[PDB]
Structure 1
């Protein structure tokens, strides 16, 4: 889709540079994209790839890296707290919130799988939404919750040619 072409554009931008170092905005955009796709190894390697002088010159790189450390340790509740600490540039204003949504979905998976019963406070910390998302669990999704115990209960959700190829390979 368009995401593939956008990634191709970033690959082109990274491929050639005046001296192997690109502009700080595109470096921050690449680091944010690496954080978005959960490709954290390339994210940290890009972070150490940045020269120390330009790294210390701008604090936006520091904030992006702090978000990267927060997501590296899988500290879900603190990801939203850290992502809101700083203000991002305008050209990446709407997409970074989208990244938050992505993390949202990630947390949802980590609750739907690997949790038969989850404490309401821990569930709210993982998803980030304080109390209202719990409602979305029962009314919309279809779970069954109960009060006075705060125990959320997640619920776990062309060939003939191939065979001819196999026989042709095996017979010869």
Structure 2
């Protein structure tokens, strides 16, 4: 969509724009946008190469590498709790508004084939909703819950003729 273009723009402004060190705005923007695309391998090195002067001056970046560890050591309640802890200017607010949706869709896709019967209490922590609100919204998708025990059962949801001629012309030379 539009986030990939922003990502490559910050990559270019990190490489060739500065005299070795870029501005904290683009630094934090890139750090937070790496997490959205699930690229923790690059994000760890981005945090490791940050000079130890932006970290001690612009402390907000230290906040962003507080969501990341939660993705690193996979912990969905940790992700949801840490996202709702800090706040910055209008540079990461739409980043951590699509990160929320991405994480909540990742959890839904995770408990759709890994689990065939899961407690509703654990499902609420996975998706990131209150248990009562989670169970009622589950039933629309067709997943059959089971009350009085809280055991939701997730349920699974033009040139060929040219190519063959190209293969024949190659085999026979």
- What is the aligned partner in structure 1 of residue 164 from structure 2? 163
Contiguous gaps of at least 5 residues in structure 1: none
What is the rounded CA distance, in whole Å, between the counterparts of 1:71 and 1:3 in structure 2? 19
1:14 Cα deviation (Å)?
1.9
- What is the aligned partner in structure 1 of residue 131 from structure 2? 131
Could you say what the CA RMSD is over the residues aligned between the two structures, in angstroms? 1.6
What is the rounded CA distance, in whole Å, between the counterparts of 1:170 and 1:136 in structure 2? 61
What is the rounded CA distance, in whole Å, between the counterparts of 1:112 and 1:133 in structure 2? 18
Contiguous gaps of at least 5 residues in structure 2: none
- Residues 137 and 169 from structure 1, CA distance in 2 versus in 1: closer, same or farther, beyond 3 angstroms? farther
Q: TM-score, normalised by structure 2?
A: 0.92
1:99 Cα deviation (Å)?
0.7
1:24 Cα deviation (Å)?
0.4
- Residues 136 and 19 from structure 1, CA distance in 2 versus in 1: closer, same or farther, beyond 3 angstroms? farther
- Residues 42 and 17 from structure 1, CA distance in 2 versus in 1: closer, same or farther, beyond 3 angstroms? same
- Residues 163 and 150 from structure 1, CA distance in 2 versus in 1: closer, same or farther, beyond 3 angstroms? same
What is the rounded CA distance, in whole Å, between the counterparts of 1:163 and 1:108 in structure 2? 42
1:6 Cα deviation (Å)?
2.9
Higher fraction of helix: 1
**Is the CA contact 1:116–1:155 (under 8 Å) kept in the aligned structure 2?**
yes
**Is the CA contact 2:36–2:95 (under 8 Å) kept in the aligned structure 1?**
no
**Is the CA contact 1:31–1:46 (under 8 Å) kept in the aligned structure 2?**
yes
- What is the aligned partner in structure 2 of residue 71 from structure 1? 71
Bigger shift: residues 12-21 or 67-76: 12-21
What is the rounded CA distance, in whole Å, between the counterparts of 1:133 and 1:100 in structure 2? 17
The number of residue pairs the alignment matches comes to 172
